Amino acid sequence: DRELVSIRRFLKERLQRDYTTLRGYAKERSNVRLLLQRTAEMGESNSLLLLGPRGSGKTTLINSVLADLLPNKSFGENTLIVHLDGNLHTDDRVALKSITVQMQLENAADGKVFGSFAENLAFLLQCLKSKSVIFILEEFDLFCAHHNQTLLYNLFDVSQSAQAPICVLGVTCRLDVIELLEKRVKSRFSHRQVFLFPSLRRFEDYVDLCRDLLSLPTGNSLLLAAEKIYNLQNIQSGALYFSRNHFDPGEYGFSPRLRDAWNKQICKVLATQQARSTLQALHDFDISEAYLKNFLFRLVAHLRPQSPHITAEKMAAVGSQFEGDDKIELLCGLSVLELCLIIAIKHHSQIYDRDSFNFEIIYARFSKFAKVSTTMQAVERSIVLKAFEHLRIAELIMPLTKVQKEFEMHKLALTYSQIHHCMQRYQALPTEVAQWAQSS
Amino acid sequence: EGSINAIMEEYRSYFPKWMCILNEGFNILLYGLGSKHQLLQSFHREVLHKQTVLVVNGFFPSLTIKDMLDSITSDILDAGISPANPHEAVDMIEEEFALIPETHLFLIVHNLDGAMLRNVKAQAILSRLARIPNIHLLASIDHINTPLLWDQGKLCSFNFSWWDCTTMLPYTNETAFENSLLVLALSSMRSVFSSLTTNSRGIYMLIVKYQLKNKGNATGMPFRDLYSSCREAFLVSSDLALRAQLTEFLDHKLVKSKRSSEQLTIPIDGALLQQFLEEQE
Amino acid sequence: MQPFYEEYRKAWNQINDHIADLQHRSYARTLEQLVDFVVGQAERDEVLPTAALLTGINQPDHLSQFTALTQRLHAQRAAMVCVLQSRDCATLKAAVETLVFGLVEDNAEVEQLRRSQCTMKQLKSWYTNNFDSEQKRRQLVVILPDFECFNASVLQDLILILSAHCGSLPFVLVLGVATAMTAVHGTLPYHVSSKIRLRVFQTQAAPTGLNEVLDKVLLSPKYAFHLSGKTFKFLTHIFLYYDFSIHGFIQGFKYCLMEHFFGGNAFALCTDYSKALGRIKQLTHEDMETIRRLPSFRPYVEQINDCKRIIAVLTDDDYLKKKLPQLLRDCLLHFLLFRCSLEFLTELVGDLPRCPLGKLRRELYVNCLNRAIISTPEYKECLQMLSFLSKDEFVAKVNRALERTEQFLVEEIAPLELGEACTAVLRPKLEAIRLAVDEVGRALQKTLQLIETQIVQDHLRALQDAPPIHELFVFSDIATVRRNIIGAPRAALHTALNNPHFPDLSVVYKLHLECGRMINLFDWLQAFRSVVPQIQARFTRAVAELQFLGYIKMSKRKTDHATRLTW
Amino acid sequence: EDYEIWKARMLAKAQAKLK
Amino acid sequence: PCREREFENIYAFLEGKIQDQCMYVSGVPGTGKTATVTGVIRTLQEYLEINGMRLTEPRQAYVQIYKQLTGKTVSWEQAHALLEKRTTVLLVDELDILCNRRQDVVYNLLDWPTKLVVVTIANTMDLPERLGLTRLTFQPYSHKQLQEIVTARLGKGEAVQLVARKVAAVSGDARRALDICRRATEIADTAAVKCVTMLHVQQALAEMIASAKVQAIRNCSRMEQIFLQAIAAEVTRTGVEETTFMGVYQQVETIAAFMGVTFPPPGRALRLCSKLGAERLIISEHSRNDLFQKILLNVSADDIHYALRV
Amino acid sequence: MEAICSSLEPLFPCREAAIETLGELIGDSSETYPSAIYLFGHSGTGKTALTRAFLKECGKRQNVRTAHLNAIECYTTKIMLEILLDSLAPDQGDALKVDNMLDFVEQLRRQAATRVEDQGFLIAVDNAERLRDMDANVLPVLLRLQELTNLNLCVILLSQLPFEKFYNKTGLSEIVCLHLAQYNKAETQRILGSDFQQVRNQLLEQKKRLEICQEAVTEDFYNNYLNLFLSVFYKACRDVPELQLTARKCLSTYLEPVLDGTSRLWRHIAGPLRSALTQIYMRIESLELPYYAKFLLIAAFLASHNAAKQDKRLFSTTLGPKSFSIDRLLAIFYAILEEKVGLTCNLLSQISTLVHLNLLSFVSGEQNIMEGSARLQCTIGLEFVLQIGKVVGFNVRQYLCD
Ligand SMILES: [Cl-]
Ligand SMILES: [K+]
Known part of the structure; x- marks a missing residue:
């Protein structure tokens, strides 16, 4: 009843948020923790860089380490964190402005001229004198793409010169990120200080993660987590990028019976074979946390008082919805004439080994079919041209490159198997089209 | 030598009519065999006189229509530098000249043929200009297919009064720039670039872009970054292909490879490079 | 200022005003229709309405149309219009900016920022602020004078944007298209065409308008200045065979008129009979000389007795200045009669099949000024054809002719000075013919003969057989003007390079001709050396000059071979 | 024919007529 | 030789x-x-x-x-x-x-x-x-010839032949063999021993597998690895370095069908390609040009070998 | 959320499941959104109106701030940001400024909220196909806009294409993909049959004629007519709105017979039906050329059709028109002209004017027209060329090699 709604809310919020908690990766967590401990507690400067496939919570690992390291207060008051993103912070100047703002030194820097970026960063760091900074650059390559790599040069130069305490935590999915650095930047950067995120190769870990994400934790766990988050929310002005709008598990409360029943059901469901094979498929495909959280969000979202029980059939259902093909659906969505054009193009492509086609040829074939058709009779030219255009706009037909509309040469962007499945799946063919597509 | 001189004096006697012609919203045009530079200069020297008289040397390749619009907009109109888009500048010119009557500006285009005036846009701009009644156009033609780039509107805006004016003298200043096989150059490069294939042009665009992005410092470009950028864009099959392409660029002496890593210097100024990229748009 | 220039200005302004009036009359209908359509939309979704104007193959003539429509719509206070020139819409950004800025400026013009911040949102806000509850909505019209020159993508995206913003904003746009609607349907797909809901509008083509302006202006008796048949034919030729530009015709005509009156003060006489006499008073010996020098004066000085008068003419100016008010009178009256005769003969020759002598008044005008009508077999054929219809047809025909020339005499000669004379001379002949018709096989040929002798013979005379000093009012010298307007330089270069009319370049050119298509440089140089260190330099510079002219191209088709582009 | 020669010719014809 | x-x-x-x-x-x-x-x-x-x-x-x-x-x-x-x-x-x-x-x-x-x-x-x-x-x-080079080359480098019995056969068996290619031999020899020199042992080869192997690209490939999912192998196959069949998605997908279907795995439709494969393209293992353009997008391979066969087949 | 679906179901029939799932994802504000949704389906599937109505009802009954937008209008990012922000930040006008994406994220982040008043934000980008043609940072930021703003918000992307044509060269985030396919014949007929009472009352409002009209109109009649209409139309078009409109007009035309004192009505409706079927997707309510221009044009067409070394004798059609060297065109022109007029600037201006009118179009080197040698291509023909030939009197067919 209300309980299902509660649980659904909980799971949804947990999936789409929960910016701090990460499971496993002890070595990496400890490593980053130690490095940040160095920079914060001992006051030295370093340049770290994280590589890993897009989907694996590496930013989450950073958030977790910070989540554990910040509330010590001995570290909290002294250090401050600056978040930067290659997609948002472009043009360098924007980044510097945002650094100024994030250090809470916009007022102390208001109305001042600076010759270069460096001379500005120096002032910004001077205003801190003490205190230390942790720069966190997401999409590092996009920062490598910037002009002269000024930001990176100066940050790493400050990291190399050991002047003032700052740490540069880079985050990217790009292996050759190191090769994108200019010599002067690459020289000032700690080589072989890059650490690769291995992700969860093992499938049992995947299933266990799924179980953890779907299951409900003890009230005490929720209480502790809530407390920790609340403690995180009070640090600084409360403006950390993993504090605002957090999971906040202190808003949900589940009775012991409900918890036991639910978790028992989850285990029972993940104990079965079909669920496990569904997860096996997902794992075979993308092996990323985001994919799993997507599948699970979809699975959780479909919980209703009509079907309050999460079951393997649902997992297999959503899995099937994942394994589906969109283009074949859209093809089935088409009209008859359009599909007849596709068939003509298929014939043309099969006979001439994927030679480019021109509207005239397809119209010629469709006409040759039309003149002897029962249904496609008395329908010519204009509509066919409209259908062709429609196919062009839907990018079912790609063009290779003002040329004439009628005389444009094209490439077709479907696979014969897709068209075949379309024929098999399309309702309701007028039988002539089948035979027209069947042979000859 | 006396015949041509007499003919020059005749074409000097042709002068006082041209003014009356120009007054009536017409523009005179000369399609002589030899150079008509001295003639137009004499016309400017004697007839025009007064103030507010512009001159345009079409055979100088270093010029651009943009700086010309800037030139006319700067001092004469006293409005400032002309806007980026030439047609906007032309709109301004139209408005301002319409605003101020009885102040006629005589502009003389030596060798309207171009380049740079070979592009249709320049002719469009010059037509839009000549369409204005305040200003007056004294162009000269030499190339054969010059009227190939004039459509109806442009030719109609160019209320043209054709005059023979066939002089026999050279063609020294004009021919001096016309490079031949019988004997870096900015004009030549765009054609040499136009003659290239798509991919080659693409590579050249990559290198010239990289060069533009880093014009300051006074310290491109490495072969590695070029290879990377080219391979990334699927413009080159392998290293040897790029080196071959560079060798082809070296043969035409467009690019220059300074080895020390292998740096690929372009031995030309940045302004004309910006002009290049600008035209390549 | 000089007198001839004053007459030039007056004449030119009169003519231009006339043509402008005719054009305004021509545009007025479709204009009113357009405005009606716009307000029609103003009264009373998702799709924006549009109006297609089929102004074929004369883009620069129909800008005054859109301008007039702007002025009219502004006068109507029904809407504000912006015009987008394909040159100002290279990108979508520039298009929308130009659109908004245009509309704003238009409103600013009617009521009596910068392009960088001309968003559609800002326009919508501005429109909402200024007048959202008028209550009767205004309209935002968007003119596209040059549809052919537009970018397909930019156009489509623009139409889509405008279509999207309907309901909230009352958008309208007119399509000035050259080709038929096939170009519109060819340029736009169906998913964009399904947002237009257009209504086709037509405008009279340039040929009809030319026939109109020719018939109504250049053949009007009001103007003392006339074009020779050859010039007339030349202008109509360059018009009908090349550019259908009314403007080009007007300007060519202007150049002819200017070239005509710039002969001297003597041509100041080419005016109304009243204004000419003052000029006669003002004339000087040089003018007497230049009016003495011209043709059709010697035959006048020849046909005369009492040689003291001959010497009085040749020597004394004051005596010659007494004949002018009679000679000019005769010329003006003659051409008056000439037009009055054209108006009659054209109705008689036009209706016939074959149309050998002519169909339009201009054709007759040319054919009559060029050669004698009686001598040419076309006229004889026309007579032979006329003598066969007979019965009510012929009678009705000649009656139509007479009614036409009469109406013309009442309408187009009455207000004119020397109109009483022309009417007094012509009317009795028309009466005589009318009686000769009222008499009506033999009386037929009698009537035809009467028409011939009374009109064609004495009034519709050629230029050779024309009143003394028929110049000043007529302008020949077509060749020079033709050369000055037409511009055929390659011929001049050719003949200038072959044989100098006043020469290494020439020799190089001759060999270059002798070659064929591709030219080895060495043998070319050797031949040039055969004909004539220094020589090599000469050859190089010559070849470079040829390269500069564009007669030869430096090719890579073979080792050191040049390819000529000429034929 | 030239104008001055023609004028002179007619003048001569006049001088001949007067005789 | x-x-x-x-x-x-x-x-x-x-x-x-x-x-x-x-x-x-x-x-x-x-x-x-x-x-x-x-x-x-x-x-x-x-x-x-x-x-x-x-x-x-x-x-x-x-x-x-x-x-x-x-x-x-x-x-x-x-x-x-x-x-x-x-x-x-x-x-x-x-x-x-x-x-x-x-x-x-x-x-x-x-x-x-x-x-x-x-x-x-x-x-x-x-x-x-x-x-x-x-x-x-x-x-x-045949297995026997490979063994001969390895043995010739290292210089029917006994120890040298054993290590040679091992290196030949593991390497597969002659280049990888000679490389492993080189590294093993370096380790042998560093370890102050005249003859090359097995632990040297094991060390070299581990050092070759420890590289970033190999671990990166090893971290990929099954379908991704299949995709890489498919690209490789396409490069092997065509002889050109650059592949187009279609052929790659065909090879994917072949390999997947052989392995018994049912590979997902082209869309998910374009997703896969884009992911791998983003991670810089391969090099690919958008997928706006599905079936016609060009897929370059940025890992080399040796790394794939050490990653998958060792 | 149930009220929303309950509120949308009437307006959108045969879309209950879609509304349900699309309701499961975005139904309630107090529940977390998926952060990114992408439903795809052909034009006229009714996806935009569905999204719009959904946003509307959510906006009405819940504490959510909507923001609908079309991607075609966004010729630059700043416009998108301005529209979205202005729509998401109400009562803020002529005072808001958005320099870049960062500022947008910051401002939306600044809008903020409190949990107890569980508000929500959801954006709908119509025609999202364009997003992958702008900046290449808009899409990845949008699909991750929830996580960048720490804000319970969700981005919706509509399009015709499959999402597999949206992936970037670098790092695209996860997004929930939905689907809408066109309605089956029965569903379409039902949707077309639903508006019976309205068109009935309208017809009645539109005198013996109105009586016999009133006497002979029922759901069966309408459904029969619609069945005919679908039988003749639905093969070529499944776009339901088009069917509505065209059916209405053709209904009038189908209606007039029974009113004139007269099954089968198939004949004089099939005519208009096909005649309307050919006139679909377009709303409703002799080129005069010079002589030498016409000759240039027909010469160009004769250069288009007959190609290469046939010029010697003279002086594949479905593939297209061939290329012309201006010299070849002038040659063919002077060859075919048989009047032999010397070239004048006006004539070369004529050919330039011809290419400007898009009657001719070049393909190679627009700049090197003079230096040699641009390649022109003729567009029009052949009926127009024959018409020209008939106007002048020249036999074009004679020169066509075929
Ligand atoms: Cl839709
Ligand atoms: K002017």
Whole structure:
């Protein structure tokens, strides 16, 4: 009843948020923790860089380490964190402005001229004198793409010169990120200080993660987590990028019976074979946390008082919805004439080994079919041209490159198997089209 | 030598009519065999006189229509530098000249043929200009297919009064720039670039872009970054292909490879490079 | 200022005003229709309405149309219009900016920022602020004078944007298209065409308008200045065979008129009979000389007795200045009669099949000024054809002719000075013919003969057989003007390079001709050396000059071979 | 024919007529 | 070195065609064909060599042929003409490139001897079938030959032979074998021992597998690895380095069908390709050009081998 | 959320499941959104109206701030940001400024909220196909806009294409993909049959004629007519709105017979039906050329059709028109002209004017027209060329090699 709604809310919020908690990766967590401990507690400067496939919570690992390291207060008051993103912070100047703002030194820097970026960063760091900074650059390559790599040069130069305490935590999915650095930047950067995120190769870990994400934790766990988050929310002005709008598990409360029943059901469901094979498929495909959280969000979202029980059939259902093909659906969505054009193009492509086609040829074939058709009779030219255009706009037909509309040469962007499945799946063919597509 | 001189004096006697012609919203045009530079200069020297008289040397390749619009907009109109888009500048010119009557500006285009005036846009701009009644156009033609780039509107805006004016003298200043096989150059490069294939042009665009992005410092470009950028864009099959392409660029002496890593210097100024990229748009 | 220039200005302004009036009359209908359509939309979704104007193959003539429509719509206070020139819409950004800025400026013009911040949102806000509850909505019209020159993508995206913003904003746009609607349907797909809901509008083509302006202006008796048949034919030729530009015709005509009156003060006489006499008073010996020098004066000085008068003419100016008010009178009256005769003969020759002598008044005008009508077999054929219809047809025909020339005499000669004379001379002949018709096989040929002798013979005379000093009012010298307007330089270069009319370049050119298509440089140089260190330099510079002219191209088709582009 | 020669010719014809 | 029969075959063919007054060799890159052919051409002690890479344009082949034949340089058309007008042996290297683009040059080039001697070197043995002569297939070094090479490097019994056989078994390719031998020798030198042990090889192996790309590939999912292998297969079949998605997907279907795995539809494969493209293992353009997008491979076979097959 | 679906179901029939799932994802504000949704389906599937109505009802009954937008209008990012922000930040006008994406994220982040008043934000980008043609940072930021703003918000992307044509060269985030396919014949007929009472009352409002009209109109009649209409139309078009409109007009035309004192009505409706079927997707309510221009044009067409070395004798059609060297065109022109007028600037201006009118179009080197040698291509023909030939009197067919 209300309980299902509660649980659904909980799971949804947990999936789409929960910016701090990460499971496993002890070595990496400890490593980053130690490095940040160095920079914060001992006051030295370093340049770290994280590589890993897009989907694996590496930013989450950073958030977790910070989540554990910040509330010590001995570290909290002294250090401050600056978040930067290659997609948002472009043009360098924007980044510097945002650094100024994030250090809470916009007022102390208001109305001042600076010759270069460096001379500005120096002032910004001077205003801190003490205190230390942790720069966190997401999409590092996009920062490598910037002009002269000024930001990176100066940050790493400050990291190399050991002047003032700052740490540069880079985050990217790009292996050759190191090769994108200019010599002067690459020289000032700690080589072989890059650490690769291995992700969860093992499938049992995947299933266990799924179980953890779907299951409900003890009230005490929720209480502790809530407390920790609340403690995180009070640090600084409360403006950390993993504090605002957090999971906040202190808003949900589940009775012991409900918890036991639910978790028992989850285990029972993940104990079965079909669920496990569904997860096996997902794992075979993308092996990323985001994919799993997507599948699970979809699975959780479909919980209703009509079907309050999460079951393997649902997992297999959503899995099937994942394994589906969109283009074949859209093809089935088409009209008859359009599909007849596709068939003509298929014939043309099969006979001439994927030679480019021109509207005239397809119209010629469709006409040759039309003149002897029962249904496609008395329908010519204009509509066919409209259908062709429609196919062009839907990018079912790609063009290779003002040329004439009628005389444009094209490439077709479907696979014969897709068209075949379309024929098999399309309702309701007028039988002539089948035979027209069947042979000859 | 006396015949041509007499003919020059005749074409000097042709002068006082041209003014009356120009007054009536017409523009005179000369399609002589030899150079008509001295003639137009004499016309400017004697007839025009007064103030507010512009001159345009079409055979100088270093010029651009943009700086010309800037030139006319700067001092004469006293409005400032002309806007980026030439047609906007032309709109301004139209408005301002319409605003101020009885102040006629005589502009003389030596060798309207171009380049740079070979592009249709320049002719469009010059037509839009000549369409204005305040200003007056004294162009000269030499190339054969010059009227190939004039459509109806442009030719109609160019209320043209054709005059023979066939002089026999050279063609020294004009021919001096016309490079031949019988004997870096900015004009030549765009054609040499136009003659290239798509991919080659693409590579050249990559290198010239990289060069533009880093014009300051006074310290491109490495072969590695070029290879990377080219391979990334699927413009080159392998290293040897790029080196071959560079060798082809070296043969035409467009690019220059300074080895020390292998740096690929372009031995030309940045302004004309910006002009290049600008035209390549 | 000089007198001839004053007459030039007056004449030119009169003519231009006339043509402008005719054009305004021509545009007025479709204009009113357009405005009606716009307000029609103003009264009373998702799709924006549009109006297609089929102004074929004369883009620069129909800008005054859109301008007039702007002025009219502004006068109507029904809407504000912006015009987008394909040159100002290279990108979508520039298009929308130009659109908004245009509309704003238009409103600013009617009521009596910068392009960088001309968003559609800002326009919508501005429109909402200024007048959202008028209550009767205004309209935002968007003119596209040059549809052919537009970018397909930019156009489509623009139409889509405008279509999207309907309901909230009352958008309208007119399509000035050259080709038929096939170009519109060819340029736009169906998913964009399904947002237009257009209504086709037509405008009279340039040929009809030319026939109109020719018939109504250049053949009007009001103007003392006339074009020779050859010039007339030349202008109509360059018009009908090349550019259908009314403007080009007007300007060519202007150049002819200017070239005509710039002969001297003597041509100041080419005016109304009243204004000419003052000029006669003002004339000087040089003018007497230049009016003495011209043709059709010697035959006048020849046909005369009492040689003291001959010497009085040749020597004394004051005596010659007494004949002018009679000679000019005769010329003006003659051409008056000439037009009055054209108006009659054209109705008689036009209706016939074959149309050998002519169909339009201009054709007759040319054919009559060029050669004698009686001598040419076309006229004889026309007579032979006329003598066969007979019965009510012929009678009705000649009656139509007479009614036409009469109406013309009442309408187009009455207000004119020397109109009483022309009417007094012509009317009795028309009466005589009318009686000769009222008499009506033999009386037929009698009537035809009467028409011939009374009109064609004495009034519709050629230029050779024309009143003394028929110049000043007529302008020949077509060749020079033709050369000055037409511009055929390659011929001049050719003949200038072959044989100098006043020469290494020439020799190089001759060999270059002798070659064929591709030219080895060495043998070319050797031949040039055969004909004539220094020589090599000469050859190089010559070849470079040829390269500069564009007669030869430096090719890579073979080792050191040049390819000529000429034929 | 030239104008001055023609004028002179007619003048001569006049001088001949007067005789 | 172990390639001698091919050397004699080529030598015999060339000598025969020389004395009497069009061969086609093919093999994977690890076979070393050009060295052998040039070896035979050096053993004879008109000849002009051409490479599909040294030419910016395939049509420009005629120009270089011209410059090689009659100096100095002329347009490709006039070159095609002078060629059209016509012992002269001709070696072509990496013809797959030239053939991949326009095909006219190669068909011509093979029509030309039918009427001199041209030898064409390829990375594939089915390109004329995709559009008469003597063909020669360069097979890879056999296991025995591999063992022989490894043993020869390290210098039927006993220890050296054992380690040699192990290295030969694990390496697969001769290059990887010689590389592992090099590293093992370095470790042997560093460890102050004369002979190369097994632990040295094990260390080298572990060090080769410990590289970033290999672990990166090892971290990929199954479908991704299959995709990489499919790209590789496509490169192996075509002979060109760059692949187009379609062929890759076909190879994916083949490999997946063989492995019993049911590979998802093209969309998910475009997603896969984009992911791998983003992670810089491969190199791919958007997928806006589905089926027609070009997929470059940015890992090399050795890394894939150490990642997957060891 | 149930009220929303309950509120949308009437307006959108045969879309209950879609509304349900699309309701499961975005139904309630107090529940977390998926952060990114992408439903795809052909034009006229009714996806935009569905999204719009959904946003509307959510906006009405819940504390959510909507923001609908079309991607075609966004010729630059700043416009998108301005529209979205202005729509998401109400009562803020002529005072808001958005320099870049960062500022947008910051401002939306600044809008903020409190949990107890569980508000929500959801954006709908119509015609999202364009997003992958702008900046290449808009899409990845949008699909991750929830996580960048720490804000319970969700981005919706509509399009015709499959999402597999949206992936970037670098790092695209996860997104929930939905689907809408066109309605089956029965569903379409039902949707077309639903508006019976309205068209009935309208017809009645539109005198013996109105009586016999009133006497002979029922759901069966309408459904029959619609069945005919679908039988003749639905093969070529499944776009339901088009069917509505065209059916209405053709209904009037189908209606007039029974009113004139007269099954089968198939004949004089099939005519208009096909005649309307050919006139679909377009709303409703002799080129005069010079002589030498006409000759240039027909010469160009004769250069288009007949190609290469046939000029010697004279002086594949489905593939297209061939290329012209201006010299070849002038040659063919002077060859065919048989009047032999010397070239004048006006004539070369004529050919330039011809290419400007898009009657001719070049393909190669627009700049090197003078230096040699641009390649022109003729567009029009052949009926127009024959018409020209008939106007002048020249036999074009004679020169066509075929
Ligand atoms: Cl829709
Ligand atoms: K002017």
